[PDB]
Structures are given as structure tokens and as C-alpha cells.
Design a protein around this ligand. Structure first.
Ligand SMILES: [Zn+2]
Ligand SMILES: [Zn+2]
Ligand SMILES: [Zn+2]
Ligand SMILES: [Zn+2]
Lengths: 274, 274, 274, 274
């Protein structure tokens, strides 16, 4: 019957969560992942659906997401376990026609529910749909170790943080020319932190939560994972450099300007001006 | 015949020990793990039992554990090897009706015996049963690298250590609001260190052994592993931050207070007051 | 029909890219790998070829590579994915009789193309063929973490950098007696950086791209991987030592001289003279 | 026919080399491993032997090893590859009746030969046979990262180095009460470094090669691996502590004395006296 476990999107959710677990980014339940699907992705699996899908209201109306299906990670669930029991740890949800709530079509067994960061995820999907004319389809949150560490030692400022990350690996300006947004510390699992994240997502594909972690957005699971992996790689390099006493030389303004010109990207002005 | 190797609890012991080995927490024989079971868990496997179960006395009477079965790791056994030969490296034991000793029903082949830290494990199970009205079922000890390193550089004080761990990842206050107990250095494998650990377990779900490692307690293998993983993740972040010259900003008192209110936990007063 | 996926060279490309992914050297699309084959390697797989091979021009004429087949990684492709879909992420190309372009005989499906660093790869293959009388067959680029970090803190000078790497593990002088060439930072994906790399390859088997990564050359995939792994291992040791305040003792001039004599290698004079 | 690949000793050599590769201790060909067998181990596999075993002389007479079989890693071979092709990368050798040379009974295909550190291995086996009344059976060399790093920053002195390693994890005094011998830097692959190593092995189960790596001896593969893993774990902890500015508190003289008394070991006097 096909079997939705072996669908591209369940397999992709398993790969991304497992890979993030192996990176050391997702201790316990600390990360969450949502992927926007099309009806055509799930329609062939209608017989895999729960016969009697559960309904859960959204935190607030989200009419831009009306009729939209997603695959999501569950609240309190461990990225390490996704590969062991996808239907326990993931769910397929479909937002209803008013954007007021969703049905759980598959997964989230034994009364599990979507991630407690659903506001941050779905509100950010709304802003990224608008910002990218529908190209972006993934919001990923993880507890990326070196990025977290840097939030205790670098100025928590979009321009400063972006410039240091650009400097810490040549590809970074090309991968995230729009830079990294950073919020004040905020209480997690709230619609305040969720819309604050979504507002930053209007201008950046990466958003940092000081003393907590990162959110990224992109068109595909691999592109979004790779975005975060790039930023975290640069952060890893920076932690080493700072631990050795700091940069004696680095990528100059530009050199960053030449890089952006070659790759046809416009670097965030404030980060470049530093 | 079912085959107890494929039981949830043998498989779970394999997963936790293997995962801890991969983390770098359990060189050689350095860690131990005990899980309290119910008779109903093991009864279906009676035919897998040793036909003639061995009897070993406990170090002291433990009448609260009368008639209680456990699955345990063996003395001198390596976490790395559990997956290769579960019955060599694990045993199922059942404490007798007086709490004076136990029978080895399965495993611990070739005259192996339970971990030399059995006092610390079983005495801590007794105190956690009382403290949690029977909810906690696991005691896990590992040589968590960054937590160990921090015991050489942070004040070995419950309030100080707890506050720094809370600061080193936002989730920590929510995961361990009761904080981390820390003992003086003590000679391992003794009932002194075992009851000292058990006494700390009355007030905390995590206990540090300076220059040695950590003990954690929780209701399930994953929750207990995840508790330790959380604390060790924060410790990893802290080691990076301290190596870069220390915190320039951090989570404030709260912010910790707001966090606790949102998640309905009461943070350890002494750690909050700092 | 044999099946070229299971050929030694496809399997070897999978092993090297996967191993480099596991090392943390190849986030996103950040690395590339090319291996020079003989017609006799691919001829048994003619029926696996695309029936209608695509043609792509080279950036400039490369007549030394006329009629030469290679297996290559694709542009924008992830080392992590090579094992999952070799034909999506790798291609077999054969340079035409004038050295002006190549046909894609196998792989690079869905209009993928070879790595954007093809100039650096193929121009370096030309110079290594000349320098080694045809022995070298591999060019590997990765984002080797510790080597990258060191480019922010060590003088970006061939003699200085080579000497520190020699000091950081005893084998290094024996593995790379010719030292490590290092370029100025340059914009990637250009023929300028490609021939600059190729010129350094005339004199060294390793070339560093500051703030970016490393290129290595060797006769086989394992020897080339092992060359880079050796340099990166030494770099890892050095990052630790520098983070602990620097060397209190080290390998002397040599001792390096005695080492070279025993193993019959001539160490780079400028690095030795320091 | 049984198949010697699946013998306990070939499987054990695969496990130890693979595990050491995963630890990051054995880049390229950098490590070597030898295990002393009994005739009874190999006799059941006589039909797996090369029909016409090769003979190679030893570097010097070793009559204590007369008629003794070993399984060994090959010169220039990679620990990473042992699992992929055991017979290419390992050999079974049997020393002849005069101790003058050995026959390659199995493995070391395509004219491979035993490790270039065979003097250090076999001479150390001789001294450990005498020191342990035949109990020790394994000599393992690896490029243990943190131990290497410490040789640039700690005094290369047996007492000093041993005491710091004892301090860096509580188990270390119990695992290696005889301490760690350390040689001056010496040119590798020589009988000078081999007997110098063997002489240190008279008094210690671990020997450090500054700026290079470690040798360990023990009765079984797991015990020897675990010995090295323990020392390297402590070294890892120490590198973190030193990078954070050094110890503010540590294990006292003890405390070390009490530890040794409890576990019935006599700690190396010179290290204790510090
Ligand atoms: Zn989070
Ligand atoms: Zn322990
Ligand atoms: Zn690159
Ligand atoms: Zn070596």
C-alpha cells in the first residue's frame, strides 16, 4: 500500500532529526522541525491516515495556512527516537479551511501533540511564505552548541554577530547574505517568542535565541539543515579562534564585498559596514 | 518463545548504554545503570530464566525493595559491549522477600555480578521511590566529560553549580528545577558514598561526584538519559564560554524566575538567590 | 551487469565523502573531490552509461587531460548524500580529444554539473601529473575545521605553517615533507583561485585557502584522505596546545632532521630553517 | 569451514581498530596493534592458512617468543580499513623455533608486512610476559589526541604526568597504579625506540612517546583498549581544565592514598609524593 513511513517526507524528517541528534544539537526534547507539504504529497497515503483524525485548535487564527498540510515533530519527543518510531514522534497535520486549527491525519500516537513551539514554527512559515513568494517550506530549531556558546560572549546584535559568522567561514556570506537576526532572551513556548521570531524571519533566514538556540528557514530539509550546519560550523571555528586568543587576521570588508559580487548576493548592509 | 533479549527493557538498556558509550561518557567500565521493573514485565519470560538462579546478599537490608525486580549492568563490564552480548553484561535480579539479597534470574553469565556501585544505585532507588511516590524507576551513573571538567574549576557547591548549569542552556531550570546536589570527593564503591548519594537524591534528581561523574534519577530510561544529557550539554556550553574568557551576558535571575513561572516549576531557592 | 555503483571507484568516492562528512569537514556543499581514472576502469560499464551523454565545455583548454576520464562530485551537492544517491551526487566525465570539454557518461542526474571548483581540481591534476610523473590521481578539497581555525591565528606563510604542523604530530614531516602551500584569501570558484592552487601544487601536496579550507593531492583516495587527515590531526593537537597557553616543549629542528634522514625524505628547507 | 574471519581474535582486532579509528586516534596508518595467541586458537583454522606461508626475519633474536603466534596490523595499513578487508590489513604470524623470524600464516595479502613498529611491539611483549608472569597478551599503540597535546604542555616526567592523569579522573589510579612511563622524543620505527619502550614496560603498563602517542599493554584487547581510553579520557578532562585556567581544586594526595588502599593497589611512589 506504498506505506507512508517510506515516503520522501517521512524519510526526510527521519534523516534531518537523526543527523541533528548525531551533531549534538538536540539533547532530550530540545529541537523541533516542521515541513510544509502539498496535498499531492499526502493524497496517495489516505489509507494510512488515522481513520478518525484528532482536531486541535491553533493558538491564533492563521488564515494564510488554510488547508495546508505539514509534517511536524511532537511535543516532548526526542530527535534521537524519530528513527525508532516515526509515527510516535512525528505527525502529519492539515490546517482547516479557516486557519483556526488542524487535524492530525497520521502519527502523534498515544495522544501526542505537535511541538510546543508551534507558534514560532507556523507564524514563521507565514512570514517566510510572504518573504520568499512561497519558496520556503521548512522551519528548523535546534540547540546548536557553538552558536549557543557565542551568545554568552559576542554582542547580541544582528550586525556584529552576522559579521563574525561571515568571517568564520568563507561560504557564510553566500549562504546567508541576509544575516542572522537575534532576539532578546524570551520565555520559550509562547506566542510572544513565536511572533518575535516570525518578525525577524521577514528579514533573515536564521534567527538566534540567546542562551537557547537557533531557528532556520529554507525551501527543503537539506537546504535548511545545511544553512544551520554552515552557521554552526563557522561558530565552531570562531570558538576555537577565540579560545586561542582571537583573530590575528580575518576576512576583510573588501573581500566580503568581492565575494558577494561574484556570487550575486547583496550582503546585509549593517554587517558589512562594520 | 518471545526471547527476553528483545524485551522493551533489555532493548532499552542496550540503547541507553550504547548511546552513553557514543557520547564518550563511559570509557572502560566507568558507568552503571539500574532500572526498576514490575513482576508483570518479566513474568512472560520465566522460561528464559536461568533454571538455577544464583543468590547474592545485599550490602545492608533494603526492605523497601522486597520482591522487586531490576535490570542492572555488571561489575567490570563495558557499556560498549552491552549491545554485543546483553546477557554477559546485564542481569535481571529480583530482591527477596526480606530485602536481604537477590536472585540473578537472567544474565550476568560466567559468574558476573551486579555493578560495584549497587549500594549507590539501590539506596538511591529507595530514596527516589519515597521522594516521587514511586514514579522514578532509573538510576544512571556516567562519566559525563564536561560536568567532570567543571568540578575542577567551579565551586563544588549546590547553589553555585546549579545556577551556572541553569544559565548554560535555557531548558535546564525546567528540566532540573530542584538543582544538582554535589558531594565531597569520596572513595567509590562504598556504602558511605552510596548513602551519601541517596541522601542528596532526597532533594535533587542529579548528584555530582567531584573528579568522577554524575548520577541521575527519573521515571524512564529516556527521561533519565535526557536529564543527564541536558546537564552535560549545558556543561559543554559552559566549558566553551569559560575557555573564551567567561560570560559577557547570561540568563538573569529575573528571566529564570519568569521561566519557572511559565513552566510551573519551583526553582531551588539557594541557586536562584545568587 | 556488474553495476557501476558497486565499482571500486564509485564505492571509494562514497567512502571518502562519507568519512569526510563524519569528520565534520563538509557541511552543506562545502567540499569537492575528483579522481582520475583509466579507460580500463570504466570500459566494462559502458552499458551503464547514459545512452546520450551530455557535453559541457571546460573553463579553458586543458590538452594534458585529453581523453581522460574522472569521477567527480557535483556542484551544490552534499557529501552527506553521496552514500544515499551516488548517481545524483557524483558523475563520471571523460575529457574530449582536444581538452576543450567533457561528456558526462554516468551520473549527475537531473541536470547536475561537476563541482564549481573544477578549475582548481583539473588544473591541479595537470600540475600534479607533471610533478609526480603521473602518480597522483586525486584532488580533494574539504573544510577541515582545525586547519581553518589556525588560518586566523598563525602567520599565513608556507614555512611558518608547515613547521607548526610538522611539530604537532611526529608523522607529519614524513607524510608531507614538501610542506603546505598557502595562498592569500581569494574569491572561490574562479580560474584565478584554481590556477593559483595549481601553481602551489607544483611544490606541495597540500594547499591552504585561508578562512576556507584545504586541498590535497595523492595517488589514491585513501592516501589523499590520509594526507589531509594527518594535517588536520596535527592542527587539532595545535589548537588544544595553543588554547592551553602554547608549547612548553616541542619537536626540535635536530629531531626533524633526524626524522627526515631515517625516512629518506627531504624536508622543505624554509620550514626547517626556522 | 569455521572461516577465520569470524574467529574471536580476528573479530576482536576489527573491533579494537575500528573503535580506535572512531575515537580519532588513528589517522592514516598511525597506530598498530599486536595480540599474542595460543596454538589452540589458530589450529582449528589450519585450512585457512596460506598454503605457502611467507617467512620474514625479526630485527633481532627473540627466543622468549619462540613458537608463538600473534595477530598483527600491517605496515602502512589504515585502522579505518581493517573492517573492510581484514586479510589485507591484518596478519597471523608464528615465530619460528629459534626466535629468529616468523611465518605469515594468514593475511597480509599483496606482499604486505607487519607494522614497522614490530620491534616496539614484540620487545614489549617480551618484557610484559616477564613482568606479568605471562598474563599480558596485547600491545596497542595509537595517536591518542589529548595525551599527545599534553606532551607539549606538561613536564615530560613520569611522576608529574602520572599524577596529573590520576587527578583527571578518579578511576585512573586504580586502572594504572604503576603510572605512565614517558620516553624522550625518539625516531620511530627503530629498535632503539622499541627497546626503550620495552624497558619502560618493565615498570608501567602505559608508555608515552612525546609529540607522537601512547603504548599500552594488558591481558585482553578490551582491557588494553580500556586502559588507553581511561588515560585519554583523563587527558581530555585535563585539556578542558587547563584551557579554563587550571585546577581550582583536585584529588588530593590523601584521597589518592585512600583510593589505593580501598582497591588494593600500590600507587607509584614518585607520583604520590608530589
Ligand atoms: Zn529549544
Ligand atoms: Zn564511576
Ligand atoms: Zn570550499
Ligand atoms: Zn605512531
Amino acid at each position: 500500500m506504498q506505506n507512508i513511513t517510506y515516503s520522501w517526507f517521512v524519510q526526510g524528517m527521519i534523516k534531518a532529526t537523526t543527523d541533528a541528534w548525531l551533531k549534538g544539537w538536540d539533547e532530550r526534547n530540545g529541537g523541533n522541525l516542521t515541513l510544509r507539504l502539498d496535498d499531492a504529497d499526502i493524497a496517495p497515503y489516505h489509507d494510512n491516515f488515522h481513520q478518525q483524525p484528532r482536531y486541535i485548535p491553533l493558538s491564533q487564527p492563521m488564515p494564510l495556512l488554510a488547508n495546508t498540510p505539514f509534517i511536524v515533530t511532537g511535543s516532548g519527543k526526542f530527535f534521537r527516537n524519530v528513527q525508532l518510531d516515526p509515527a510516535a514522534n512525528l505527525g502529519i497535520v492539515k490546517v482547516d479551511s479557516d486557519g483556526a486549527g488542524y487535524h492530525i491525519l497520521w502519527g502523534l500516537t498515544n495522544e501526542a501533540v505537535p511541538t510546543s513551539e508551534l507558534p514560532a514554527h507556523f507564524l514563521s512559515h507565514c512570514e517566510r511564505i510572504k518573504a520568499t513568494n512561497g519558496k520556503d517550506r521548512v522551519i528548523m530549531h535546534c540547540h546548536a552548541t557553538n552558536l549557543i556558546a557565542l551568545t554568552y560572549v559576542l554582542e547580541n546584535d544582528t550586525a556584529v554577530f552576522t559579521r563574525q559568522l561571515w568571517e568564520g567561514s568563507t561560504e557564510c556570506l553566500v549562504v546567508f547574505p541576509d544575516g542572522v537576526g537575534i532576539l532578546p532572551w524570551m520565555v520559550p513556548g509562547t506566542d510572544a517568542i513565536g511572533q518575535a521570531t516570525a518578525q525577524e524571519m521577514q528579514k533573515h533566514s536564521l534567527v538566534l535565541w540567546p542562551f537557547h538556540g537557533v531557528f532556520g528557514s529554507g525551501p527543503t530539509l537539506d537546504e535548511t539543515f545545511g544553512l544551520i550546519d554552515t552557521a554552526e560550523k563557522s561558530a565552531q571555528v570562531l570558538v576555537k579562534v577565540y579560545s586561542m586568543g582571537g583573530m590575528k587576521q580575518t576576512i576583510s570588508r573588501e573581500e566580503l564585498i568581492a565575494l558577494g559580487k561574484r556570487f550575486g548576493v547583496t550582503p546585509l548592509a549593517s554587517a558589512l559596514a562594520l
